[PDB]
TrEMBL record:
Gene that this polypeptide is encoded by: RvY_09119-1
Signal peptide positions on this chain: none
Lineage of the organism: Eukaryota, Metazoa, Ecdysozoa, Tardigrada, Eutardigrada
Similarity field: Belongs to the globin family.
Residues in Globin domain copies: 5-134
Residues of the full protein shown: 37 to 190 of 190
Name this protein carries in UniProt: Globin domain-containing protein
Binding site for heme b: H71, H99
Molecular function GO labels: heme binding; metal ion binding; oxygen binding; oxygen carrier activity
Protein keywords: Heme, Iron, Metal-binding, Oxygen transport, Transport
Keyword NAD: no
Length: 154
């Protein structure tokens, strides 16, 4: 499929690396959203509950657990849908479509997350976050953002 960003070898390397990573999906989902709130503290106001809290208060907060999981599981579905490009495209476009109802949401907001996902992958995988994996994730997460953006424009 010409639409899919990765070669067959890099695709299998992705699914292998992600499935060991998805063992701590809730933990990594929390660290991803916290990194969004650390780097871009304006994003905290879209979730009014998370404004007053320290980083460790959120990690244990149940409303943060649900929000963190809802942001990491589309990426987990995306890796699962790597052979089904058409289902992969539908799911990522639907994700970008959800944000239209959110007041004052911008198209450029989605790109802030890929910096935070690589952070989540770095801390969770640790020594499993290899030189080869850093390259593969860089191309892949950038591509998912493009398709999430497509759902927001359309
Ligand atoms: C590109 C990565 C992102 C993914 C995969 C993602 C995923 C999702 C999903 C699946 C939903 C729907 C939740 C549901 O009803 O089940 C959602 C809603 C939402 N997302 Fe995102 N999102 C992303 C980026 C962002 C960014 C950058 C922000 C800005 C802080 C954001 C803020 C929100 C808000 C405020 C909602 C609605 C809150 C609610 O009523 O639940 N998201 N997101
Ligand atoms: Cl398909």
């Amino acid at each position: 499929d010409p639409r899919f960003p990765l070669t067959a070898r890099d695709k299998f390397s992705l699914v292998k690396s992600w499935k060991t990573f998805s063992r701590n999906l809730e933990s990594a989902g929390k660290e991803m959203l916290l990194k969004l709130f650390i780097e871009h503290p304006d994003m905290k106001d879209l979730f009014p509950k998370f404004k007053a809290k320290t980083p460790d208060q959120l990690r244990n907060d149940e409303s943060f657990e649900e929000a963190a999981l809802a942001h990491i599981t589309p990426y987990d579905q995306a890796v699962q849908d790597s052979d089904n490009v058409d289902i992969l495209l539908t799911n990522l476009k639907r994700v970008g479509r959800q944000h239209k109802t959110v007041p004052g949401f911008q198209e450029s907001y989605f790109e802030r997350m890929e910096k935070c996902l690589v952070f989540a992958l770095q801390t969770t995988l640790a020594d499993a976050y290899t030189e080869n994996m850093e390259r593969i994730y860089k191309i892949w997460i950038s591509w998912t953002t493009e398709k999430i953006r497509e759902g927001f424009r359309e």
